[PDB]
């Protein structure tokens, strides 16, 4: 049970950095396309 | 939707926090 | 055997976001890297 | 290699429903 | 037991990469601002 | 503090090796 329990958080956890690196991914595409457009 | 990068810290933090107490808790 | 395949499942999705992560700091180097030479 | 960004993001919600599925199967 | 290793080292990656995510976030919220300034 | 990206790469392999043959060891 403390098993489950950890992979249910661990989940959690990567869903947030999956939220992270899609944030990251459009912030520094906007940044490149920026300067391209510069 | 609402997340902000200081809100992901805090729910990063407590979620970490829980599975240590978890796995340690196993270690027993 | 749930816990085991959740576990195969989520070393995938880490190795994705492994995947991402260097993606990115590659990318951002490259800019940080331009506009130094700017 | 092949990876491309809606490569990755079609990949990561597939292995994410399969792991809600084995947890809450567990859950039983 | 394999199980519970498997976790114990999982969340070590997960740590390394929410490290790398926010190493990423300060780098290219700096690189916004040095572009907002200019 | 010491982190480095190569040490994180270094530290990513390591753990990941070490997690396939957990779970390997586990199928058998």
């Known amino acids: 049970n403390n098993?489950?329990?950890?992979?249910?958080?661990?989940?959690?956890?990567?869903?947030?950095?999956?939220?992270?690196?899609?944030?990251?991914?459009?912030?520094?595409?906007?940044?490149?396309?920026?300067?391209?457009?510069? | 939707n609402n997340m902000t990068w200081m809100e992901w810290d805090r729910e990063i933090n407590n979620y970490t926090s829980l599975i240590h107490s978890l796995i340690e808790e196993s270690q027993n």
Chains 1, 3, 5 share one sequence.
């Open chain 1, 3 to 38: 098993l489950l329990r950890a992979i249910e958080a661990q989940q959690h956890l990567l869903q947030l950095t999956v939220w992270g690196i899609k944030q990251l991914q459009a912030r520094i595409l906007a940044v490149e396309r920026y300067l391209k457009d510069q």
